[PDB]
Amino acid sequence: PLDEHCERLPYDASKWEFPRDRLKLGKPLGRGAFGQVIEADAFGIDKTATCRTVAVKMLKEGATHSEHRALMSELKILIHIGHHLNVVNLLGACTKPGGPLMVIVEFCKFGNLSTYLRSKRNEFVPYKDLYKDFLTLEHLICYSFQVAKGMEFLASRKCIHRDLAARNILLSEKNVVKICDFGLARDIYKDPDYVRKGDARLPLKWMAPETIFDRVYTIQSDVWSFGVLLWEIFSLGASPYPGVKIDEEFCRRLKEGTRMRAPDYTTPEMYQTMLDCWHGEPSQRPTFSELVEHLGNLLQANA
């Protein structure tokens, strides 16, 4: 993957630089130790003379030059990745001296998918006036399909995600979901999804065994995380491994082949897809291209 050597990638200011005076900063959408994402109104960022609500990642009190460098690398990799319906897309950046580095991307109205799905437990029917804004199996399979599409796209750009999870999937209008990476804008030392392992705070419940045990990150470890994301979707935003202490024993049992049981809203095919994504052998997990085909088929079969 090339997303490990981002520093060599271009930042074409003539294309991407957006004047700070055309950006009206609003309320925070999330804050971490060193970073934050702010809602903003950007004047003419993507359509002439048109105000657009955007999401702006920038640093905050606590951040150092190290985080600034990291955010610049994120900007460069976003340019490299480019645009897809199912990825949060870069719209512009403010990089000029005299103000903070700001990475400006599409704003997703409904925010993170885990929180959203958890808010819809009382507004779900597998199939359907009364149920106008209800989620259905079609929605859940559709979100799954879309994330697979976005990951297939990221893979085509020779990138890997490394923190795939429902908290990093954002819901926009018209049931479009987008892969994001909140990164420094999340407080990982305070977020229970990130567990202390050594001197790192890691998303253990989403990590493939080879990642946990061997520090190996590949597109196939993202497929494992995608299986966990599927479980999150088909549990309507439940936390993975309910009633399991996330410790050395968990990791051992996981490596041994123990897996989550089927969540409440799954279809049998979807649960089997989860199990497939959780193959112990990375090369035996489906690829995102295969998942795209498969989920497209399940989405159609639902219709």
Ligand SMILES: Cc1cc(C(=O)Nc2cccc(Oc3ccc4nc(NC(=O)C5CC5)cn4n3)c2)n(C)n1
């Ligand atoms: C590498 C790499 C990095 C990224 C990346 O995504 N960077 C990124 C950049 C800027 C903001 C950001 O986070 C966002 C983005 C859109 C958004 N919309 C909401 N909406 C809400 O909160 C709603 C009120 C509920 C919240 N955000 N936060 C993520 N990628 C894809 N790859």
